Amino acid sequence: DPMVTLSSILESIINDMRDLPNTYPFHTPVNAKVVKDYYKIITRPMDLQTLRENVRKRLYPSREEFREHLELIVKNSATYNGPKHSLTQISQSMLDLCDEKLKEKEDKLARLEKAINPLLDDDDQVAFSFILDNIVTQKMMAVPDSWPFHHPVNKKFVPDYYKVIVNPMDLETIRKNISKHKYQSRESFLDDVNLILANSVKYNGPESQYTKTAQEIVNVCYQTLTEYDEHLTQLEKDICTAKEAAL
Ligand SMILES: C[C@@H]1COCCN1c1nc(-c2ccnc3[nH]ccc23)cc(C2([S@](C)(=N)=O)CC2)n1
Numbered sequence: 001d002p003m004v005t006l007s008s009i010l011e012s013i014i015n016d017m018r019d020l021p022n023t024y025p026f027h028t029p030v031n032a033k034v035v036k037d038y039y040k041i042i043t044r045p046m047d048l049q050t051l052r053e054n055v056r057k058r059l060y061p062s063r064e065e066f067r068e069h070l071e072l073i074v075k076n077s078a079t080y081n082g083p084k085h086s087l088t089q090i091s092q093s094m095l096d097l098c099d100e101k102l103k104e105k106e107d108k109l110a111r112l113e114k115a116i117n118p119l120l121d122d123d124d125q126v127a128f129s130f131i132l133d134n135i136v137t138q139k140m141m142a143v144p145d146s147w148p149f150h151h152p153v154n155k156k157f158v159p160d161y162y163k164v165i166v167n168p169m170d171l172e173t174i175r176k177n178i179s180k181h182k183y184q185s186r187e188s189f190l191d192d193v194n195l196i197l198a199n200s201v202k203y204n205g206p207e208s209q210y211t212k213t214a215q216e217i218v219n220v221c222y223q224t225l226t227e228y229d230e231h232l233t234q235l236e237k238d239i240c241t242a243k244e245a246a247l
Contacts, residue, residue: 002115010055017094046072062113124238169195185236
């Protein structure tokens, strides 16, 4: 079972990162009753024990989902302690070691990932994701003053944001989903794109400049999809055929 082999590799990486100096503050969940403001600042807590339990629950079908959770450990420290705090440097040392090990094992990992999810090896899936990513970076992120939508809102800077927006979405998260080949057609991609606009309508109001910008992001997305419609339609058909064949 390739998911088991993959999981054993990921756990070994966790063992190696746990062994780096001064990493103990990251080995187990923050005690939110001692660090009493922690959840007022941090939205996505993560630690090496939770990461290991997620590996054991087989939640990670590839390098990328594992690494995204690992990176939260660094981002949370950067937000809570500060970008240059020793705790943030320590957590960065674990992400760096992870990246070394992932590089050393990349061919074995690619093979496991493809055995777990054959679409990661499908040339039509790959081409489709490449086009979506270029639409995001060259068209949607190029909309003037689109910076509020480039990354997740940091609750440190907008403290009530996630009390209002319980289904957040942003363009970086979409790019990560594209890199994971989450989208097999333009409809699921557009579900996420439109969630960005819906969240701005809900949080900022229909007439806010934030919402006008988000509306422009969605509109140039539709315009660019229309320009590539016939290629995208062929790719979506061939992906559906590949998806059905993996059965
Ligand atoms: C103007 C506020 C205050 O100044 C500090 C940052 N800033 C801000 N706002 C949003 C945002 C997005 C959508 N709708 C919103 N409504 C109100 C704010 C808001 C996003 C972001 C970032 S970030 C720094 N990762 O948090 C880039 C994602 N920063």
